[PDB]
Amino acid sequence: STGSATTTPIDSLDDAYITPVQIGTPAQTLNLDFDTGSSDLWVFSSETTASEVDGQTIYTPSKSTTAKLLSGATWSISYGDGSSSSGDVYTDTVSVGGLTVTGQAVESAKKVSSSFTEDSTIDGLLGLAFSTLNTVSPTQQKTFFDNAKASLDSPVFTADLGYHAPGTYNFGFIDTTAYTGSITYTAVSTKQGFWEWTSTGYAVGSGTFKSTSIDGIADTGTTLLYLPATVVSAYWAQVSGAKSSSSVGGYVFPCSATLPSFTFGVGSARIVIPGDYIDFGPISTGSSSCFGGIQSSAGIGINIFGDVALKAAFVVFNGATTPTLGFASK
Numbered sequence: 001s002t003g004s005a006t007t008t009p010i011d012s013l014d015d016a017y018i019t020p021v022q023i024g025t026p027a028q029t030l031n032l033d034f035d036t037g038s039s040d041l042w043v044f045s046s047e048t049t050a051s052e053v054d055g056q057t058i059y060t061p062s063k064s065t066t067a068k069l070l071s072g073a074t075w076s077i078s079y080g081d082g083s084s085s086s087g088d089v090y091t092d093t094v095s096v097g098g099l100t101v102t103g104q105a106v107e108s109a110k111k112v113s114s115s116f117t118e119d120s121t122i123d124g125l126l127g128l129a130f131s132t133l134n135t136v137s138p139t140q141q142k143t144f145f146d147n148a149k150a151s152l153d154s155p156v157f158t159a160d161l162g163y164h165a166p167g168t169y170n171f172g173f174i175d176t177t178a179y180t181g182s183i184t185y186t187a188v189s190t191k192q193g194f195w196e197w198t199s200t201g202y203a204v205g206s207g208t209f210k211s212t213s214i215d216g217i218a219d220t221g222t223t224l225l226y227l228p229a230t231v232v233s234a235y236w237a238q239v240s241g242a243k244s245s246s247s248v249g250g251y252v253f254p255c256s257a258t259l260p261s262f263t264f265g266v267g268s269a270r271i272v273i274p275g276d277y278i279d280f281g282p283i284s285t286g287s288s289s290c291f292g293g294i295q296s297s298a299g300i301g302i303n304i305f306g307d308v309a310l311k312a313a314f315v316v317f318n319g320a321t322t323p324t325l326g327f328a329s330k
Contacts, residue, residue, distance in 0.1 A: 001151045002172035003099025007034065007161065010121040013280055014307060015223055017161060018121060019169055022095040023106055024064030030057050030123035034169055035221030036159070036195055036317065037304070039133035039143050040077050041094070042085055042107035043124035044116075052112050055120030061108065067092045075107045075135045080222075080300060085112040089136055094144060096126075099171050101148050105134075105141035125221065128157065128317065133193035145171070145319060155319045159220055160330070161311035163277055179314035179328035184269035188323040192302075194219070195317060197325050199305075200267060202227075204235050205260030209270070216303030218310060218317070218325055224280070225262070225273070225308040226297035235262055235294050242292070248283050251292040255282060262294060264309060266327040273312040 007019040018031040023043070030043055044053060046060040061067035067090045076086035087110035094104040109124070116122070127134070131142045149155045152172035160178050161167040168178070189196045194217040201211040214227065232251065236242040238260050242253035253259070259275030278293035293308040316326030 001099055001148070002153055002170070003095075003097035003148075004168060004170045005097030006166050007169055008166045009162070009164065010119070012164070014162075014164060014311065016119075016122060017167070017220070017307070018123075019096070019126070021126060023059055024061070024092050025066040026064075027095070028057075028059055028064065030059060031121065032124045032126040033122050033221060034126050034128055034159075035219070036128040037217060037219035037221045038077065038079065038125065039127040039129045039131055039193065040075060040107050040135055041105065041124070041126045041144055042075065042077070042087070042109055044112070045087070045108040047087060048109045049111055052117045054117050057123045059106065059108065059124075061090045061092065061106075064092055066102075067106075070105065070136075070139075073105075073136050073139060073141075075137070077135045081115070083113045083115045085109045085116060087111065089141070096144065096171065097169070099148055099152075101144055104144055104147055105136060107136065128220070129195065130190050130193045132190070145317075148172075149319055157317050157319070159310055159315045159317065161220070161307055163274075163311050167311070174316060179330045181329055182269075183314070183316060183326040183328040184266045185316070185318070185324045185326045186266055188325055190323060194302075195323070195325055200265030202231055202265065203263040203270075204238050205275075207238075209263065209265070211265070214264075214303055216297075216305050218305050218315060220307065220310060222304045222306030223308070224304075224306050225294045226300055226304040226306065227294065228303065229296045229298045232294055232296045235260070236292065244296075248289070248291070250295045252283060252289045253292055255288045255290040257290075264305075269327065271309070271313045271327055271329060273309060277308055277312060
């Protein structure tokens with residue numbers, strides 16, 4: 001089997017991407033944030049504290065003939081950005097882009113943090129990291145991909161995120177028309193439960209490539225590119241007037257600037273992030289200070305190849321017995 005679904009930016013800045021997911025019978029379609037940095041499929045629901053729902057579409061398990069309470073199971077997750085959610089668990093039929101999993105754990109939120117409430121466009125998350133990170137207790141549950149894997153034509157999914165435009169998540173096949181040149185594959189460590197890999201270096205603009213190992217994760221659920229402070233300083237040093245602002249929470253730059261590109265290495269291959277992808281717009285409405293899309297990972301504890309990086313590539317998440325990641329230009 002295969003599946004293919006379009007993923008759409010939630011706003012004009014590509015702050016996140018949503019993908020329609022069918023849950024239950026008859027189908028209830030929710031728009032979920034596909035997150036290769038976590039491993040829980042959770043949704044706003046009829047059980048979510050009413051004051052914490054503001055515009056989201058909810059899953060109502062009582063209206064699904066295939067929903068079953070997973071008795072005694074609870075979940076609770078805290079994300080790197082300090083957001084959180086928790087609740088109980090149903091199993092139900094879940095389909096993405098024509099690919100169907102029966103008996104998928106659907107984690108129903110009883111509580112969500114303010115950042116989730118305030119984002120009316122995101123109805124929940126669909127985790128695509130390794131199932132070892134799943135938070136369901138006392139019986140850990142599998143991700144949608146893990147459940148689908150054996151049925152797929154090939155045990156892979158691909159992320160093809162757009163810049164200020166829709167893109168595609170495919171399951172079970174590699175669309176050879178969706179990228180240019182060749183796909184370069186690189187090793188993954190699953191030790192921390194992430195799609196963790198090592199970039200071979202970087203360049204800023206038309207500058208020389210610096211060969212250096214940068215361990216990080218491929219994370220579709222993180223907006224920005226978070227890299228070591230040395231790398232980030234080298235980038236922003238090429239933008240007149242750019243500075244790190246403790247009050248704003250990262251590097252800002254004059255909105256009048258033209259940003260240089262940023263290149264990252266994948267083995268001997270190179271992925272080029274155009275400068276425009278690094279512009280996240282005014283820090284507040286009407287400001288001439290703009291927020292940067294490349295930020296320091298210092299104090300996160302891990303480097304994160306988030307959407308800023310991934311949207312410059314066609315990315316293969318190869319879930320074979322020994323997982324790997326593939327990157328191609330597009």
